[PDB]
Amino acid sequence: GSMERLRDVRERLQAWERAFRRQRGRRPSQDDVEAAPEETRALYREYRTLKRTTGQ
Numbered sequence: 001g002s003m004e005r006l007r008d009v010r011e012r013l014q015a016w017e018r019a020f021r022r023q024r025g026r027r028p029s030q031d032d033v034e035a036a037p038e039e040t041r042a043l044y045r046e047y048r049t050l051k052r053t054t055g056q
Contacts, residue, residue, distance in 0.1 A: 017048075033045065
């Protein structure tokens with residue numbers, strides 16, 4: 001179905017958390033969070049809130 005969206009999102013999330021926890025090594029800040037666009041913000045905050053809350 002959505003190969004372009006899934007590919008972009010999947011890659012965006014992977015790289016995101018990748019370098020994120022690599023340099024940040026902790027919860028993000030309003031500076032980096034508000035730095036990203038709406039779409040990205042939702043995606044990041046989504047996997048971030050789910051991963052942080054859940055703990056998986």
